[PDB]
Amino acid sequence: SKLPKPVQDLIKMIFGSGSGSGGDPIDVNYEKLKTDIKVVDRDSEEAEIIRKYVKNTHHNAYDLEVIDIFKIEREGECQRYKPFKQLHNRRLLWHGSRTTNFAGILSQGLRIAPPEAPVTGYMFGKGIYFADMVSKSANYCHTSQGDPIGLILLGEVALGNMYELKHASHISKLPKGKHSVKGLGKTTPDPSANISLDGVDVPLGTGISSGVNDTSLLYNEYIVYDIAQVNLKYLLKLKFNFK
Numbered sequence: 001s002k003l004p005k006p007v008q009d010l011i012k013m014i015f016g017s018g019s020g021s022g023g024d025p026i027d028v029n030y031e032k033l034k035t036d037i038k039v040v041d042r043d044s045e046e047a048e049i050i051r052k053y054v055k056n057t058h059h060n061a062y063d064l065e066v067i068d069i070f071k072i073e074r075e076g077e078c079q080r081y082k083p084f085k086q087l088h089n090r091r092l093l094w095h096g097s098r099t100t101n102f103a104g105i106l107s108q109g110l111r112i113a114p115p116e117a118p119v120t121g122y123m124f125g126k127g128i129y130f131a132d133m134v135s136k137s138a139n140y141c142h143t144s145q146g147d148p149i150g151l152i153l154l155g156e157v158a159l160g161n162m163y164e165l166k167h168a169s170h171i172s173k174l175p176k177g178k179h180s181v182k183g184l185g186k187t188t189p190d191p192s193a194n195i196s197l198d199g200v201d202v203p204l205g206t207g208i209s210s211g212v213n214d215t216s217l218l219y220n221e222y223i224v225y226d227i228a229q230v231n232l233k234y235l236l237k238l239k240f241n242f243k
């Protein structure tokens with residue numbers, strides 16, 4: 001395998017041996033992801049922006065520490081995103097998931113739960129859910145004290161005109177001219193620190209009080225209902241440091 005070590009370690013992490021796992025070399029599993037993966041240089045400004053994003057948008061439970069930052073390009077996704085690439089309000093947002101899902105997530109992308117599934121466990125319907133604060137997303141890694149390494153995505157999400165809710169709707173259907181849902185949290189990143197890569201907003205202000213009174217959520221949530229509104233950009237490998 002010519003692939004860089006961090007990339008090889010990641011491949012190992014999300015496929016894992018044992019059973020029908022004594023088999024399949026690194027490069028074959030990599031090609032299986034239908035994804036280009038490059039290591040973001042630790043010294044890059046890209047890396048600095050991302051570490052600031054992690055550091056600032058994070059209390060109690062565990063301590064997050066970045067180990068590796070990967071730039072990812074899933075086959076065909078950028079071309080799929082073109083419909084929404086010139087739609088106002090695009091943000092770089094977090095998506096955590098458990099490691100065992102990342103093989104599927106990288107090869108198939110993030111997907112909309114099938115229409116037949118029941119509506120419980122979908123606070124804002126069957127969509128793709130993001131956060132503007134890593135701590136929120138990082139709980140969905142379900143990482144343990146025993147294996148305290150986790151994977152979180154950063155995706156460019158084309159939110160457009162948001163539909164702003166303080167409570168669960170449980171439906172996947174938006175009013176006319178709304179393209180996404182913003183779950184309104186108590187805490188929000190400080191807008192005076194938000195910067196703009198590309199024309200994509202990176203909300204890396206330190207968490208402050210949002211002023212929103214009557215609400216269930218500690219943190220904002222963002223939900224889109226069309227896979228073409230998501231363009232995955234980075235994958236972070238994170239050390240969780242517990243108590």
Ligand SMILES: O=C(c1cc(Cc2n[nH]c(=O)c3ccccc23)ccc1F)N1CCN(C(=O)C2CC2)CC1
Binds near residue numbers: 096110112121
């Ligand atoms: O985004 C979600 C999702 C995530 C969650 C949990 C969650 N997980 N991760 C987060 O970063 C996050 C942030 C804010 C709010 C919720 C989350 C709940 C309901 C959901 F439908 N997906 C459902 C599971 N996904 C799939 O691709 C499966 C195949 C259908 C990815 C898309």
